[PDB]
Structures are given as structure tokens and as C-alpha cells.
Design a protein around this ligand. Structure first.
Ligand SMILES: C[C@@H](Sc1nc2c(cnn2-c2cccc(Cl)c2)c(=O)[nH]1)C(N)=O
Ligand SMILES: C[C@@H](Sc1nc2c(cnn2-c2cccc(Cl)c2)c(=O)[nH]1)C(N)=O
Ligand SMILES: C[C@@H](Sc1nc2c(cnn2-c2cccc(Cl)c2)c(=O)[nH]1)C(N)=O
Ligand SMILES: C[C@@H](Sc1nc2c(cnn2-c2cccc(Cl)c2)c(=O)[nH]1)C(N)=O
Ligand SMILES: CC[C@H](C)[C@H](N)C(=O)O
Lengths: 265, 266, 261, 266
């Protein structure tokens, strides 16, 4: 392609399994972007054509202020390059505060919930919600962007979807147990994110991957007074309603926006 | 890469001899572009002519000139993904305006001049400047932006290389095209003179009753400023045109001189 | 100098008598600036006049006044890298303005001039062309062009013939002692134009204009001012006053009821 | 132009053999700079001044000092340079409570980015040592490193052998000590020495006399004494070991160093 005729590539910002993300600069304007290079499967030796289309069709369909914007798209013989909106404020948890107040946390959280509400209203599950994928653009309460739709999927009801994916610490028990997946998995992950926001501790993280997965599958967590002594009963109830094994009993996205902790500004 | 994986095709915008141009939509973003399909000679356009057009588009980056966004090539065709101009032809927009002052006219003309100045500073002649190839990007804004299109016969002019050709639309070509004499950057300036004449009057300066008359009028530089068309036209605007409609290309006003002329400076 | 090592020069924006101003772009960052080239007198503008302008720019730091960013000199020219104003001139078009929208711009001009006058600096060239915007219902104004600005010491007479005729006080026209009061007259002229879109003293020739200024011949023609409060007219009336000692000063003007409301 | 028309001189910051560097203030703006006065030949040769200046002109990077202006009269060259107000890196580190390998590698990565830019232009600094690694402002959350003093920097041309004896003994590669051909690899050795000092606070080759130091450098006689290095990862030691290598052709290059796991670990 002509991607290098339009964008000057710069410093590497991230590597995933078959993706590399670099800072780049639009040559005409000086505006900065993120360029995500995704290796294509050519088995005359990558990611299949079908998985790239899934990511791209999902990005095409979503237009929301708390969700990353896809600006441009190129393909050469080895790679598909997505020109994405650049987030210059870095990752959430990096803004660094040990833990947060309930006001500061709820302001971030409400933005994530609005984002996920938009996604879920389109039947799109992100499946990879975690602190690393919550980016800020800058202020007392800055503006959040959800990124990385690399494993996002449209959920069709009556059509079973199973997979093993995500980062262990943040995945729902239905991922761990290889059980049917849906929009409810994102809500579990929101529960985990909320726990970390208020405490600076991960709720299920054990001494090994094996312990972590056990704790997630049995829903073994607590509100240790070392981490949660500055925590309201309301905030704990909000988390308690999300860290629920049965996905049919777990609080949904609309319910979560109407919960008293979020409603109390 | 297959063009149909990336772009959805739409309404046809234009057809040339082995090129067709359609509006298209980038599948990842929803953004609109123009797709120019060019049939390759394997009976087609020569590989050499396609490369010339493409290398010229690659090299040019200017707000008054169409932007080449991407390229696709299979065995039979070259597809150029170009910037979409949604505003239509300049002169068509001007025919929707109640009146047109010399100030408002010179503001459009200055955009064309900036574009050509950029080209000429890279030794690129367009060779096909005429109303059809002066577009607006969006005609609904307070001050629309002009875009030059169609680099189908554009050429880099190399010193110590004579370049001769017969091309362009007769009405708009310099006498050196008509007479099969050496060509350069000066041909574009003649064409700017013709465009300027039409802008202010709505009449074509050399157009005769037949192609044969038109070519005679161009070769002899037979035109006038009939009071029926030019009675509201300043002496300055006429001088600007008179300095461009000059037979000897070495005496014709150049692009830098034209930007410094009092009519444009005002 | 190394000015061209730091800044890429672009389109010409303005020419004055021995100044040219171009758009430029800082090479490291992509940030845009205005570059003002000022031709140096070599008998093979005087050094003293360039220093005056520069020392004035150095001393002034105010949000409604242009910021000097950098400064270079080569053999023919002194180049000032100035803050770029991308909103254009004030008067661009609305034909005339409402009193609310006018007073919002005007208050910014007054704050700027208040800062200047508190440092004993007269601008001497206040006019619409030198009021620039940066963008909104009421955007931010910047005063530019300190090319004839001067420090006024009281008991030191300063006389000159300068400025644009239409906007100069009668003490300029009559070659009488000048001070901070000349800016206030010019503020009166600007205010008149803001509300009406007409110039108060402009005649059919320069000769008429200068006569009208010197005699203070102006009116509030109903064609231009039927959309005008008594308060706004009083504000202007207190500025278009021949005797500079009777003319409303900058502090008084900020306290006048039209501005306070 | 006379320097005293534009800049007011202040506090002296450093003296070399025919250079003095002072803080100064730009008269038009109030902005602070460093002024480097260089006496011209009983002086520095015209050739050496041009070398330094051309190198500074060519380099634009956030971790490298910026040359702002130049003045020249018959006796002197004055370089107006960016002012670094934060002091020497190592001096800031001696104010810090502790220093983790994470916080250390964040400083080191800035030096590496700077040297990567230099080496990509075929410029060797040849004088990398703690005194020349400055912070621009030590009061911000993450201070920015600036490399200074291009007084012996050189463009390296292939097919041209370059030999010299220069630098501060403690920090020079064995090819300087042995009067062998020099290149970009000499900077990498010096980065190894700086890294050793960063993590331990000890100099790896420093002996009881200059004579011992030079012996130690030439034989590559150093260790990772457990008294200084017991809290140091195997990775950090490997990174240093790959730089303190006698044969310049075997020594880790700047690109390799940015890709090494210790640095890549963020
Ligand atoms: C492998 C990539 S996937 C990915 N990264 C993004 C996106 C947007 N910004 N960034 C990103 C990654 C690392 C650093 C920064 Cl600043 C930004 C996106 O849509 N997908 C990752 N998560 O690091
Ligand atoms: C033979 C083609 S060549 C061509 N057409 C262009 C270009 C850009 N826009 N358009 C175009 C043509 C017709 C209508 C419109 Cl809206 C746009 C270009 O670079 N070459 C033509 N002019 O019809
Ligand atoms: C000869 C210049 S003097 C001048 N011009 C300025 C300044 C700041 N911006 N501009 C300027 C001039 C023309 C256009 C634009 Cl956008 C800006 C300044 O301090 N003195 C003039 N009045 O046009
Ligand atoms: C003789 C000078 S050579 C030099 N010194 C610089 C430069 C930039 N900053 N400083 C400097 C020197 C000492 C203290 C401080 Cl704050 C700054 C440069 O390019 N050459 C020296 N190393 O002391
Ligand atoms: C007193 C506030 C009002 C809004 C302001 N002075 C205007 O004029």
C-alpha cells in the first residue's frame, strides 16, 4: 500500500501476539495517530482474513465518544494496518494513584459503562476489558477511551459461542470453564476493574495461574480491610452484583447504570 | 490486496477512453473516495503512462490538488483510490451565484494559482487545465476549496529534453500545442489566461464556429475584450489576461509573476 | 542567523512600509507562528526604532496582547517570531454588531490598553486591522503591531505624524503634543465602527477626513445608529473629544456604565 | 549582528581549554539560554569549529541539546544553546532515596534514544560520560535527559580510518587507549561504563592511577563484586557484559541495545 506515503512511523507503543502498534504522524497535517500492524496468515510461511474482517467490521460499526476511532486502513502483502486515534494520556491505572476515592472512581466508571452500554446495545462483547485497555486522553476527571477490539464478537442469541481468551486475572468463570459466552462476561470484567479502582488490588489473583483460575471459578474473593476500609456499602454491593458466577444472575449493563452508587453522581 | 475487500463501489462520476471513475466507500471507516479504474495494455493504457500519472500523484501534496490515497493493481487493471470532491465543477457553482465581483472571482483564481505554483515548483505541467478539471471539494461551506483533478496527461519537464505532443481540449490549449512546437510549464499559464477570460465574461476567447476556426484563432492569438462582455472589467484584470494570452511562451507571464501581479495582490 | 534552521517560511500575510509578515512553522513541533521581517537601514528602519519595538514587546505580557516568541538578525533584516493569530481581523463579515457582542470585544481591547497605559506605553496605531481574533459567541482578541508604540514620559514632549488618518486623534493631525490620550480617541473611533459599520470622520478625500477629525465633525446618523442606546453614544461622545485633557481615560472607560452593564 | 545586542550574559557554567559557557538571557523575550564562547585560532581551528557547528545544526532530537543561534566575529564564535537547568543526571540520582532497575532503565532509555538518533546519522559523540548527561529541569515528575558537548563529535565515513586520543580515560573504549580505528562502537562501550556506574555507584575500570585505569580498560579487567551488585538482575549484567567487549565488531550496537530484554521490559 501507500500507508508510508501518508504516515511517518515512529516509536513502538505495544506488541500483542500478532499485532504491533506504533506512533505515527500524518504527513499533510502533523496530527498524531496510532498505527496497528496486524500480521496476515500466509501458510506458504498470522491472523486469518476472517478475524481481521471481524475486528474491522466491529470498529466500522461503532461510533461513541468513549470508544477508540478507526481513522484509516491499508493492506500490503504481509500486514493489515489500522490507523487509529492516538490516546496520549496513557493507561487508566497508571493515573500514579495507589487507589481511588469513590467520586474519582465513579467518574471513570460511568464512562466505561456508557461505552459498554453502547457496545451491548449493538450485541457486541468486547471480551478483553481490563485496565490496560482503558486509555485516557489527558484534569480532575479525564476522558476515557476503550481500545483493542482484537477479540470482540457479535453475540447472536441461540448460537453458542465458546472460547478460551483474555487475561486470566480479568476473565469471567464461563471463560475459565469453557462454557457459553455472551455480553455477561464483560460485566464480570467491569466488577474486577471496579475492585481494582477502589483498592489497587486484584480480586482473584493468586500466587500462580492455577490459584487465580480456581479463585475465579469458585468466586473466592473478599473486601480486605487493608484495601477497602475507605469503601461504602453501596460500592461493595455494586461489585457483589457483578462478581456472580451464574451469568443469568449477574447485573446487566442497563441495571448497572441505574444502581444507586452510580446514580448518586 | 483486492480492491473489493476494502472499497464498496457506487455512482459513476466520469469516463475517459480506458478510465472510469466511481464514488466508493472505504469499508473500515465509511469514508468516501473516488476510485479511478484504468485498463492496462497487455487495447489499454501503456504501463509507462500509468506510472507517470501515479508517480506524479505520489509526489504532490497540496490543499488545492487532488490527493491519491491508495493504489491496487492486478494483471488487467490499476485502481487509484483518490480523494472525493463533492462540490462539483467550479463554473457550475458560479452559475448558481446571483452575481460575481472581481474580488470574489480573484479569490477562486488565487487557489488555482497556488495549486499550479506548487506543481511548477516541482517542474510538473498539468497540460489539461480547463473548467471541467477545476472542482470544489464541498460547495456548501462559506469559502469553498478548489481542487485540481486529472493528471492523465501531466508531465515532468526535463531541461535538455524537447517535449512535443498534441493533447488537451482545443479551446483551452496554447498555440505551441496547436503548432506542434516545444512544450513546457508555459502551456499551463496560457490555459489559466483562458480560464480567467471565461470567469469574468462567461465567453470563451478563441472558440470559433468549428474546430478549424478555433485553432486558427489560437494560433494567431485572435481575441478581443468586447464591451458587451467586459464593460464591468478593470484595466488590471485585462492586463492580467493579456500577459498570459501571449504567443511566444518565453514572453508569457510565469506562475510566480502571476501571484505578484497587482490584480491578484490587491 | 539560523532562523531558517528553526522555522519553515510560508505564505505572505501582510506588507507594511519596511516590514513583511509571513506564516511559518516551527520545524521541531509543527506549531505555527507569524514571522515579521524588518528591513534594516544600511547606508552602504534604524537600529534605535527596532530596539524600541522589541523592548516594548519584551516588557508586555498580557492575554489580549501579541506574544513575541523568538528573535533573529541577519545582515539585511531583523526577524521577530510572533504568536500567530488564526482568527483574522476583528471587523471580519457582520455588517455591524449588537451592543452585547460589541461590548464583549471592546472590554478585551480596554483591558489590553489598560495594561499598556499602566506601563506608560501608547500603541498609537489602534484600529480594526490591528485587532486580531484567535477563533464561538465571543472569542479572544489580541492587539498587534507595536511598530510605532512609544513610552510616554510626562514633561517630555513627543510629536509625530503617523498612523492611519481615519483613526488618528486631532493632536496627530495638528502636530501637537502626544500621549496616552491618543489611544482613547482611537478607541472611540473603533467603537463607532463596531456598532454602525461606518467610519465617523471619513470624508470623500484625505483632506476632508483630516478636517472632520480636527474639528470633531461627526454624527449618529439614524441609518447606522437606530440600533444604539444612549449609553453607547455617551461612551463614544466622551472619547471623541478634541482636548486630550478632557477626554475619558482608560480607567474611567472601564468604569463607565455601558461597560459595567 | 553583535551577540551583546541580543543576549545579556550571566552565571558561568563551565570552562574548557578555549571555550567558556555562560547562562544568558535573550533581550527580546526574557528566555534563558546557554552561550558557548569559542576562541578562534592559541585557539581552536576553523575546521574544528565548523565540525561542531555542522553537527549541532543537523541534529534535532528531544534528548539532545539544541543549537539556537550563532555569532561570529574575527576572534570568537558564540553558540547560543538550549539551557539545561536540571544539573548532571548522577547528581540528581544522589538526591534520590533509592534507585530501582525500572527507574534506572527509564533514564538509560533516554540516553539510548539520543545515541540511536546520532548513530543513525553516522555521528559519534565520543565523549559520553556522566558530566555530559544533563537533565533539562529536575523538578518535573519525569525529567528529560539531554546530551551535551559535541566538542569532539565526528561523522564517521566508511573507507576513512579515524584514529584519535581523546575523552576522559575512565570512560573511553580500548580502541581509544590502543590508538586503533574508531567508530560508532566507542559510544557503546561508554554506555556500558555509564550503566555500570548507574546501578552500582562504582566505576568499572578506574584504578589507583591513570596507568592502571588504561591497563584495566585495555585488558577489559572488571568484575561484578557482590558488595555493589547483589541487588542487580542477571539481565542488567548481561546488558553491560555485551557492551564492555574488547573487539568493537562484537560489541552490541545501539539498535540491538534498544531491543535487549532488560530495556524492552519497560
Ligand atoms: C497489541 C495492541 S492492540 C490495540 N492497541 C491500541 C489500540 C488503540 N491504542 N492502542 C495502544 C496500544 C499501546 C499503547 C498505546 Cl498508547 C495505544 C487498539 O485499538 N488496539 C495492544 N493492546 O497493545
Ligand atoms: C476520465 C476521468 S479522470 C479523473 N477524474 C477525477 C479525478 C478526481 N476526481 N475526478 C472526478 C471526475 C468526475 C467527477 C468527479 Cl466528482 C470527480 C482524477 O484524478 N482523475 C474524468 N475526469 O472523468
Ligand atoms: C506589517 C505588519 S506589522 C505586524 N503584523 C502582525 C503582528 C502580529 N501579527 N501580525 C499579522 C499581520 C498580517 C496578518 C496576520 Cl494573520 C498577522 C505584529 O505584531 N505586527 C502588518 N500590520 O501587517
Ligand atoms: C566547556 C563546556 S562544553 C558545553 N557545555 C554545555 C553545553 C550545553 N550545556 N552546557 C553546560 C555546561 C556546564 C553546565 C551547564 Cl548547566 C551546561 C554544550 O553544548 N557544550 C563544558 N562541558 O563545560
Ligand atoms: C456585569 C456582567 C455583564 C454580563 C458584563 N459586564 C457585560 O457587559
Amino acid at each position: 500500500s501507500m500507508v508510508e506515503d501518508h504516515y511517518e512511523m515512529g516509536e513502538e507503543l505495544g506488541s500483542g501476539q500478532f499485532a504491533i502498534v506504533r506512533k505515527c504522524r500524518q504527513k499533510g497535517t502533523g496530527k498524531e495517530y496510532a498505527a496497528k500492524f496486524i500480521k496476515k496468515r500466509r501458510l506458504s510461511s498470522g491472523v486469518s482474513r476472517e478475524e481481521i474482517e471481524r475486528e474491522v467490521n466491529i470498529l466500522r460499526e461503532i461510533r461513541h465518544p468513549n470508544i477508540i476511532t478507526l481513522h484509516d486502513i491499508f493492506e500490503n502483502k504481509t500486514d493489515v494496518v489500522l490507523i487509529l486515534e492516538l490516546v496520549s494520556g496513557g493507561e487508566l491505572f497508571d493515573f500514579e494513584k495507589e487507589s481511588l476515592t469513590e467520586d474519582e472512581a465513579t467518574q471513570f466508571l460511568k464512562q466505561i459503562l456508557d461505552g459498554v452500554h453502547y457496545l451491548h446495545s449493538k450485541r457486541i462483547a468486547h471480551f478483553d476489558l481490563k485496565p490496560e485497555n482503558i486509555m485516557l486522553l489527558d484534569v480532575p476527571n479525564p476522558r476515557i477511551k476503550l481500545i483493542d477490539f482484537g477479540i470482540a464478537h457479535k453475540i447472536e442469541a441461540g448460537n453458542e459461542f465458546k472460547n478460551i481468551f483474555g487475561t486470566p486475572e480479568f476473565v469471567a468463570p464461563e471463560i475459565v470453564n469453557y462454557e457459553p459466552l455472551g455480553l455477561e462476561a464483560d460485566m464480570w470484567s467491569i466488577g474486577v476493574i471496579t475492585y481494582i479502582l477502589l483498592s489497587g488490588a486484584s480480586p482473584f489473583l493468586g500466587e500462580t495461574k492455577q490459584e487465580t483460575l480456581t479463585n475465579i471459578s469458585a468466586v473466592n474473593y473478599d473486601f480486605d480491610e487493608e484495601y477497602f476500609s475507605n469503601t461504602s456499602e453501596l460500592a461493595k454491593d455494586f461489585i457483589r452484583r457483578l462478581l456472580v458466577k451464574d451469568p443469568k444472575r449477574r447485573m446487566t449493563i442497563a441495571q448497572s447504570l441505574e444502581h444507586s452508587w452510580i446514580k448518586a453522581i
